[PDB]
């Protein structure tokens, strides 16, 4: 537990949030749905690791814990209902977009135009939200059951 056992995970969250960003602009692939709300979840995970790292040290490592706990558990419940809402789409739906500036203080990763094609070829029998649900358990089940 130094600058590594965090700056690795702090890197590991860029090794997803940009992975995702690739899709937006190369494999366009515009959509968002709750996915923007979910981008945020990992920009919460960053904080944790990047703070558990930058100025490690032994006091601040207690802060990093909870924030490395919150936005992961948050992540799950966001990716979960998001997943649910396919294996179980709800007679109503909406197909909306919209909203400190969420929308404003960045365009290229905080804009959300998922105009609902009731189809996604999210690879390997699992949709992105379906993967991301798992990977978020892989941060929640670390944090608690492999740290505190």
């Amino acid at each position: 537990q130094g600058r590594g056992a965090w700056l690795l995970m702090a890197f590991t969250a860029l090794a997803l949030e940009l992975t995702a960003l690739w899709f937006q602009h190369v494999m366009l692939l515009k959509p968002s749905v709750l996915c923007i709300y979910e981008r945020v979840a990992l920009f919460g995970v960053l904080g944790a690791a990047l703070i558990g790292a930058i100025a490690p040290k032994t006091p601040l490592r207690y802060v990093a814990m909870v924030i490395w706990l919150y936005s992961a558990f948050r992540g799950v419940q966001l990716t979960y209902e998001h997943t649910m809402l396919q294996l179980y789409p709800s007679p109503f739906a909406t197909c909306d977009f919209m909203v400190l500036p969420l929308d404003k203080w960045v365009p290229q990763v905080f804009v959300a135009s998922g105009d609902c094609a009731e189809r996604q070829w999210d690879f390997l029998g699992l949709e992105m939200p379906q993967w991301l649900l798992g990977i978020f358990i892989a941060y929640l089940i670390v944090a608690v059951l492999v740290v505190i």
Partner: antibody
Amino acid sequence: EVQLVESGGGLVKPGGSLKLSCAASGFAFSSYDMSWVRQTPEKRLEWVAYISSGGGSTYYPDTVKGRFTISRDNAKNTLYLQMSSLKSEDTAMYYCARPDAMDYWGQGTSVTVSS
Amino acid sequence: DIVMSQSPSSLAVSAGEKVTMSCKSSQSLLNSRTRKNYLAWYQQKPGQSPKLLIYWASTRESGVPDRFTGSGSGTDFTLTISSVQAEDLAVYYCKQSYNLYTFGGGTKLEIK
């Protein structure tokens, strides 16, 4: 095992008002969603309101949107339908239902609108 | 909205037969992701709250005897009750749950 008993409504005048409560009992209430189905005198079946598990979102057919209000209170385990500007179309039996596809239905409170 | 419309209004049958009434919806009820046909069949006994019978279109519900069967797909559903017991006097309602909730008019299965 799982029960629903809606109640509290008889006759009400046009333009009128009146609120019904489904007393829910015998399942993890705060986890399911809730709906309010009525059945007309023709024996016809119209869905009327839908509230989400955590009171978050509600939905209505355009035929009561504005005049009707599906609240819940998982403190006292009740579901509520608050009817306002009452049309004599609203005249029907009022079931309180449970979805996961209405799988446990109530029994009805009849509500009629007349003078 | 979607319009559900069943035929016929009424059916007679001698106790123990096969009956297959039909529910047709105005709008197709299929998702691209999963063959999932978003139609339910509710039975409703004389002066009773409707009971859930079949969901999704095929799949029966906790304590539905195999005899009620749900076929259908797209805009074209059919409910089929083999070996009609006496305690099967009912109106059978189909519901769509693909976009809001709509019901059919009903089909009265009265016994001979």
